[PDB]
């Protein structure tokens, strides 16, 4: 169940995790949603080089699970956005986890509200799309970011 | 009476739930991925009296597939087939539903499609690893119509 | 909308009889008697979909047995046994109805019994011969609860 | 689907016909309600032997389809009844046709009449038991009969 998001300029693929039997179709939804990249905020569990392949470049960026990601992960992460999108505009970022709904969504969630978008409406924005994204402490962090409008 | 019941149980539907009317999961009728289909795994499956069998793998929260008996119909007993390669052939959706979704709105989705089952999930927000969608049982249009004919 | 369907349907089980919502004789799925059971028939029989159907012997008015899918569980196709045969190991009980019956006895009847199948017939006085029992078609529960909730 | 109906000292039994592979659980039936004789008032369509090697006499007496008895037919019904209930009391005499509904009520019914009951009270009490009885040929004859109180 691939989840799909848009603001401005941006575009984000939430997805699941496949496996190595599965790589084709998997392939076959991310040049769908022209996907360019992948973050993997969680265990790596599959061979990346068929995707790598394709031209799609897959990130390792695991950080702990109900966790908020780390001010470098942060950082990291808002530059891979603007570089990517400046690069191939109208492309697509792939984030996913295994276990789902705390720290993909987190990414995205950091992303939309740099992108100008406010805390509540980004927050909605997702959980309308996927139900009981965000446990408590990914919620009252990103309560707290103070973002920089990058 | 039975006339009353049945207004009553269609007065009903608007505040019942999908949880209340569900089997649990531990008291589904469900069969592993891993079956070989042979005279005995066929001929018992015959004669559970079940059109349709949960396919689960792992776990038995975990649920990959829906096997309709008349699936089995051409299959080879001699064969020894895996219930895997069979589940292939045919495609049969498989719907999720959360667990506070009115009993109407249940019938109306029942109605549309072909699809007389659906899997009972809830958000489980229990910290402090991520949120997740926890398998709570199955619901069926019969047990539906069932809460409204008493 | 739905609820007022459903609750119109009840209110309709009292003036609607068997007859108006029974599936006509020569529409009725069937099989015949002199049936074997040999891969093809049992792989028709299971690929039909139909959980029960009539057995009829000579004209297809004379329905003289029940056969359920679950029945054939360990029957052999290399036997080739006869349907006859099988119809024997079984009881299912076979309810006739006159065409005259409302919806709210049928239902009534379908709820107390482990049927969900009845014979709709009719009293024939047309001369000069003794009156008979005409065979019109075929109901289930199925038609009732479809006639309910529209 | 065989039906008794008791008089006054009268015992009468409406049954099926049987074929020869049936016979033995017919005898069965009739051992069960007593019956000492069967009157078969349609076509002969069973070996009689089995039959009275049990005990069980079978007197053939046909008439027209659709037709009231002749009256020597009404004679001889009237002297059977008479002298097999003053042999053996509390037993049961068996009519049985083909067809059904027609003519061996209407010998019963004839019997009732003779009994003392009224031609309404009759025709009910037949009816009560099987619906649709009497054409109406047989319903006017069985109104313009004239009963000896025999």
Known sequence: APVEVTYKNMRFLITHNPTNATLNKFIEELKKYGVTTIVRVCEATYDTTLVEKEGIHVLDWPFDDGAPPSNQIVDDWLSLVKIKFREEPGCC??????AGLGRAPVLVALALIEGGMKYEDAVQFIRQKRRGAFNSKQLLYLEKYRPKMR | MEELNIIQGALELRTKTVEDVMTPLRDCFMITGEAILDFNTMSEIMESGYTRIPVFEGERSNIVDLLFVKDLAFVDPDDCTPLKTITKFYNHPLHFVFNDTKLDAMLEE???????????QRVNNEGEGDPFYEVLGIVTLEDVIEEIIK
């Not at chain 2, 029942?110 to 009972?120: E, P, W």
């Open chain 1, 93 to 98: 970022i792939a984030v996913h986890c295994v």
């Open chain 2, 110 to 120: 029942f109605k549309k499609g072909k699809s007389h089952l659906a899997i009972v």
